[PDB]
Design an enzyme around this catalytic site. Sequence first.
Site, PDB file in Angstrom:
ATOM      1  N   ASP A 164       2.999  -9.404   7.922  1.00 51.83           N
ATOM      2  CA  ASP A 164       1.961  -8.413   8.043  1.00 51.83           C
ATOM      3  C   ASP A 164       2.361  -6.987   7.652  1.00 51.83           C
ATOM      4  OD1 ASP A 164      -0.727  -8.112  10.466  1.00 51.83           O
ATOM      5  OD2 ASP A 164      -0.358  -6.918   8.672  1.00 51.83           O
ATOM      6  N   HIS A 202      -0.112   1.554  12.981  1.00 56.30           N
ATOM      7  CA  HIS A 202       0.985   2.463  13.314  1.00 56.30           C
ATOM      8  C   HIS A 202       0.811   3.850  12.743  1.00 56.30           C
ATOM      9  CE1 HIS A 202       3.252  -0.775  15.130  1.00 56.30           C
ATOM     10  NE2 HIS A 202       3.122  -1.501  14.034  1.00 56.30           N
TER      11      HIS A 202
HETATM   12 FE   LIG Z   1       3.041  -3.549  14.029  1.00 53.13          FE
END
Ligand SMILES: [Fe+3]
EC number: 1.14.12.12
Lengths: 193, 193, 193, 447, 447, 447
Positions: free
Chosen positions: F205, F213
């Site tokens: 991912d 993030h």
């Molecule tokens: Fe992450």
Amino acid sequence: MINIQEDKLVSAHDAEEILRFFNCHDSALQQEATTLLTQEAHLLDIQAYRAWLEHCVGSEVQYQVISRELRAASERRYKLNEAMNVYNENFQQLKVRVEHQLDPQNWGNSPKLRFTRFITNVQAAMDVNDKELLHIRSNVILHRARRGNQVDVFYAAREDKWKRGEGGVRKLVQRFVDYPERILQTHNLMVFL
Amino acid sequence: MINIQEDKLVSAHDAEEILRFFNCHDSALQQEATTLLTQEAHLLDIQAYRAWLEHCVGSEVQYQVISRELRAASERRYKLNEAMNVYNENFQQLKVRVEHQLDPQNWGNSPKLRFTRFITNVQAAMDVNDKELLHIRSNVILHRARRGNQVDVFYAAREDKWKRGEGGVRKLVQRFVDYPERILQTHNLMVFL
Amino acid sequence: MINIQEDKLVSAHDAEEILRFFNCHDSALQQEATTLLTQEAHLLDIQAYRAWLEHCVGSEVQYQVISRELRAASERRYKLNEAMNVYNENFQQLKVRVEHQLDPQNWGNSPKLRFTRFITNVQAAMDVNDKELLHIRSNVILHRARRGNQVDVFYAAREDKWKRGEGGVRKLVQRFVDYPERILQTHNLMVFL
Amino acid sequence: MNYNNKILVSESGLSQKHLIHGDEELFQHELKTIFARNWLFLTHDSLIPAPGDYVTAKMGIDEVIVSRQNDGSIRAFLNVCRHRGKTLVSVEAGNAKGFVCSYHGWGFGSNGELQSVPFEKDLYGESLNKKCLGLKEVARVESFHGFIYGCFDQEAPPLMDYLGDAAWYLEPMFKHSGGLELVGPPGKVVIKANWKAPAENFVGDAYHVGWTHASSLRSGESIFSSLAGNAALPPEGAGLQMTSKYGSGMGVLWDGYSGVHSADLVPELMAFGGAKQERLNKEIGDVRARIYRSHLNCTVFPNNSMLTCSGVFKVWNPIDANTTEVWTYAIVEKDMPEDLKRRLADSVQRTFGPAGFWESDDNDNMETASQNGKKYQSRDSDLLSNLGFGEDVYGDAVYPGVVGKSAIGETSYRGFYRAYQAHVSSSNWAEFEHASSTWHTELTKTT
Amino acid sequence: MNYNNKILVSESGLSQKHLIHGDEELFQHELKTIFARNWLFLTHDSLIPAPGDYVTAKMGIDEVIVSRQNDGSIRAFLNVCRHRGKTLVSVEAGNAKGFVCSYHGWGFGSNGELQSVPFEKDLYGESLNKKCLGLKEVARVESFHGFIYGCFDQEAPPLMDYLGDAAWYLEPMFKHSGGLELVGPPGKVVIKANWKAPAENFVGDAYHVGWTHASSLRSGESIFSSLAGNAALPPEGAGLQMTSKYGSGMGVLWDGYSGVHSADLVPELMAFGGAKQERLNKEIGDVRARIYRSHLNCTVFPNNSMLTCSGVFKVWNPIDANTTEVWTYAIVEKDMPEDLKRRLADSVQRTFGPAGFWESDDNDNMETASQNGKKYQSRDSDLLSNLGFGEDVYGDAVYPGVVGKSAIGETSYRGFYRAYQAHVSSSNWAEFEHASSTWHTELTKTT
Amino acid sequence: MNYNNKILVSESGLSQKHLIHGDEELFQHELKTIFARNWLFLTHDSLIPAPGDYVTAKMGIDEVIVSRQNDGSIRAFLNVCRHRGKTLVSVEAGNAKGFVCSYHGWGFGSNGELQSVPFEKDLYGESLNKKCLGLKEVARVESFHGFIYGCFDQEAPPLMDYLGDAAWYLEPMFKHSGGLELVGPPGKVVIKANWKAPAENFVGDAYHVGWTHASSLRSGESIFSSLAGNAALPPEGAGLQMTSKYGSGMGVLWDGYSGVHSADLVPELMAFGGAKQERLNKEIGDVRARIYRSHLNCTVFPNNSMLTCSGVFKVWNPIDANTTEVWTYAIVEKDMPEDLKRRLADSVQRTFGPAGFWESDDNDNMETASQNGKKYQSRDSDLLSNLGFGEDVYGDAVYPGVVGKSAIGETSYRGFYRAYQAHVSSSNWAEFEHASSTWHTELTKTT
Ligand SMILES: [Fe+3]
Ligand code: FES
Ligand code: FES
Ligand code: FES
Ligand SMILES: [Fe+3]
Ligand SMILES: [Fe+3]
């Protein structure tokens, strides 16, 4: 007071820390420490993290929370790293964490979290060699609620050093917590103890 | 102290409330407030609800506990009722609740409930305009046990106003709690915070 | 203060105990009691059980924790033993428990347990007839963590009597706790409240 | 358990196996045959009045986003991202033109459509068929005078038909009073009871009021205070009970417009409702105008309950067989003065909210009844609902539905459980209908 | 799992599959084949001595009311209202002529009969058949010298027969000493262990005492203090083990009358028991008089345990496969001076109660052994109970039952698990009997 | 559910049923077909370097003791006593020649052998066959450059073969850098997510990093800070994705040696890795030397993940379908200066540990995605992993495995789920192999 050869469960560190408070009792120092900690906890509870940094935290701070590996009470040979640092932050690292909290794309902060801190068992003593250094011990229960039905409660003893900084304001220069739960059941320890 | 444009997570109300305590520190007021609250909590813990009303609660009281709907930290358009009142009681309404507790056909009260209250972080300041009005902030953990294995623990910050009434006794004239948990996991909130 | 015919939920014992604190307030006694209890809790938290016995516990102590059977609020005929003693210890019996804790073959103590105690709501009053006897009331939250993921939290009110013993040191001569939870959900009550 | 054959509810709704309040396999089966099949309360117009306004709601254990569209309609969608299944919306209400997933940033419109995908061109090219990736939509969304219900099952009856004979009783207050508003936000509290325990209690339980709520009646000084401690039985003709084909049902207590509200609100309410009743006499007739200002304790099958006049509005959101999340709103008449609405809303929460002194009386009743359903010696035991059986009528000249012409009985339990059993033993709406072709005859036997 | 064929306990009780302490399907099956079938401890005469006195007790996961009738007998009923299933009684003990349900006010007598229903005449008319609506009654209630046991199964053996060969060992203390009283109320604590872990431990585990309780033995200074840390093995002939057809079993440690009691009570107890023994020599003979003042660690199948002399009396109330609610009472000899009884009762709780320093030694043993039963690689593993196998006898001239003439062994585990397996694989008492027709031969193989 | 036929993962790994993150029956099935079958991370040489050193670790839900033998090898055993099933070792690490059970005192060697039994001679005689009573041993224990993995299944491929094409990518850092050490002890935190949610997130991912993030990227000032808030897409050729036959997979972000580490460590790291890369160019060639100092986000199937360069090393220990215990260690290059290793270890915990500000960003993503898998309307819905499908290659001249030559895609999800489905539908390793005979062809379809 404590002989650790007789009081077999007491660590040398713990016996050292207790001697510091049993001797000199200074009733007004206990009261100053109580005020300091209550105000810090108030700022943290309302999420005034910038104000906390500005008013409570010294530029030379070490903010440290460890998790100690479970070892045999009788263990004497195995000598590898005993603990890891959940936190071990200087002022800049605390500022990074504070920016992360305040960032408008911190998705985890919407809806707004709710914090309630309970500070008890305050003890205070001046250091014997550095008369500008105040030792403060206190216990905290920290309640964190979010997203309808998530509730996490943290419990810790804090060993602090506080020192007068700029404007004569007493600021945190060291906080040490040995976190009592080895496996956290609170999703994370992303709270300022 | 707090600039809420920089400390982006702090509400205007919270920043207002904190200014009230940071300025004037009055060590003996903090001690009077501690006594008042400890005695109130003692009366409540032993279920002396009539004594609580008579000795702790002013005739003009507003006793209010809200639950705030979860909204986006960035929300600016949606302007409907932000909170509901779990409690919003005048003296007569508190008396009704007290009668309900004492009624011999309140089946839920047999066997007798057990309460233990923990009051911490007391702060006190006189109001700037009404010199007879004392602002008191405190945090409570309330433990309620009943029927063998039911245990519920409540956590809250309380913003109080207390004022000298008859006999010169300081009485509660306002209590405000913004309850931190949105979905209650305690069966009900049928306790006096 | 309390009329138990009107305040129908209040026990005679509870009403008796409260009268003791409402009358004489002695601000410095409250402070001495706070110190005593904070130091006791510190010794217990670091597992200095021998030091606790030597410094906090009087030779004539009765250390008692009861569990009261659940009975009808209206019950008037059934007159058999109302409570059992979880603890009902003299000094020698406490010493036995302390030896058991310190024994190197107490397998349950490895790895080392972690205790954190939170003492709140301290009240203190001298006894009316024995001027050497200090009544102290306080509430405790006791957090016990062990073996990675076991966490037990205890909640109690403590009714203590403390008296100056040898070296002029104030020591515990009676502790009484009526434990609020009837069925314990903490594995055991093997902690010093 | 074979749900086709197992008799969980006896003929005429007379009894139910106690296990229905405790059995987790049955709970899982209800998700399918009760909650995925029937109409469930979502929200009120008053809570999402403007384009872009939204709330989250539960439908059974699923969470949905309920959003006011640009064209004034309301659509509802599973609150679950179409990519990797993250919960899309983490708040309870707001206003937005769309919802962006915090995992990988997919952006969905208020209409449920996948509108944007980060770096779609560079990553998916023209490969992503966004047209097929809209949020999973609730098949049916319909309004009953501002009250919005949803149904996952496209085959369900229209909401008006589903309300059946109960609709006639609700209309005076819901329609002819000028309309109601829901005052939010709701109280939310978890109880350790099966959703059916409070559902059955609100649908048809007048019997418990005098005993369960003895302390609240005595203390609060409401218009029903004389019932306290079963000191007095209501007069003859003090009310009635009804039930309906699809399970909805209610009690009617004549004239009790101030309901559970304490003496402080009684005079104002009794004046307000009486004045409106006088105007309604000419528009809808004496009987129905009187119904408007009579206290209805109703359950809209399966898990939505209310007390009109008292203004209590409940959703019993299922969590597992012994866990329910209770949502409590206040209902007020739109044309009440604003100060009265505020005070009425506070009084609803005061009595029936998270710290509701009345609602607290019911806690042990519901929780222990539900938890006893798990206990070995009780699983196969029979909960009784035979009060008034053999005295109910159907097709009355004045009061529609299966009707018990008494204030206190278990008529409404029987109809609720009849519908429940027909659903749990059926695979789809056609089979429910076949199972329900003689519903009122089953309910009026021995009459 | 097919309980008819699955070998959960190997031939002669030699081993058990570890899953028996963790498997929730098996736990549900035990409710039926263990707890609904066998005799379970309720209370003592001393706790309900007068007409109208009652206590609540668990029988498996069910709760019952146990009430002293006007005629001196004891009847027990499910603590569940016959109307809508609410728990009737919320206290642990009291005195009453009946129990009124707080939901709708139905009033049941101490005899279980439905005596009154609010407004019965106006509501039910003559329609309610109260005669058929009495509380669900525990089929069998019998006394063993003041100790009251109940059984849901009308087909069970009489309690005296059910105790089998174990009865002979209990009689000196239970009957010939003049009688015992139970001192209440009990301590109550939840542990995270399967009910069988403490059950097996008390039925037959002398092996663990020196190691598990090393710290308590050393610290407490009881008459068994030399065992601490396995520093010393008991003498030859220090005791024996026995077991019986229906699973009850015990260890006998000769002369250990002061048991776990700390040095402070040793002299007084050793004097008291010795004086009674001298009188009993003439009445019941030397061997049995010596048994009276010997320490018996016993389990009365399935989940009632005790330590005579120490005076510890336990109920291991099942909650789920890894949860048990432990009830701890003190047993005292009726003719002990009252001050001794008080001190003995405190000492029982001091050692084996909620803060019992001995009982705490056992916590990790029981909890981890039980929880390991859920772990994948352990489910199909074999717990061993082969110590002493091939040295047990049956039909001894002096000591009845299947008997291991050594203080330490696993004789009693084998008989407990033999009975357990026979029950779990049987549909009723007739099938248990057929499965148990060669019980003692199975246990003494290789002897 | 019939695991032989149920399509939980669609052809080519393109989608997965959402129920796989919530279904408890499937979780139980995974214990057998995933965790009892595959290689699981235990520890590192650096944590048990000397004879007698041991640690405890989880393998699925089982706990094992992992002990350094006298001859330098490592053996692992179930942490469960062979007598009555108590957990043998209650600490996390130490040094010992054996383990004594605290229940009855059986003493096992570091080699698993039953070495002593208290009073064996007096109690068992010569009857106890200690030779057959050794701790249950983990069949297979193998090392990958100091990293120790275990497997309950003797039929498993050797660890090196099991790593398949992923091994080539790990070797520069794991082998050619001079070797890694694991810095313990680990952080340990319970999250309310299925183990597969963080597993899939770490395996493949990259898409989520910029959005999930955003706050950590912006705040921390790491070498990836420009991704914050999806402000910028990485350059063309910024990296790639790979996957392998047995499910292990990773992302490669070229040159990102300082990884998530905040500006305070960037210059030092970029210098260190660059200097080592220059030396490695001559030994392993330019491409592989560049891989050494590129950021690999990898999952070693099933539940071990890591970020090389960042130095994060994770075990996702399964508890139930919506509970996982996360263990977090730091990995450091053995030849780094000690002060750098200390600071790197702190920085790993600072970002990804129990209070890791990056790791906290992921909490809601993982927990809600997992919990939504239990919700009725979502169980049968399809989680999508089609990004980049039809552009993956196999047998590339430079980069081995099934490879997506782009930094962001779902190549590694598809290979992880392909292997997962092949295991869950197979009874043993032979059947997995048969199910996997065209694995790379299945993954590169439409290419
Ligand atoms: Fe992450
Ligand atoms: S899970 Fe929502 S964008 Fe990926
Ligand atoms: S449930 Fe007991 S009277 Fe109705
Ligand atoms: S369980 Fe380990 S020695 Fe008995
Ligand atoms: Fe009610
Ligand atoms: Fe024991």
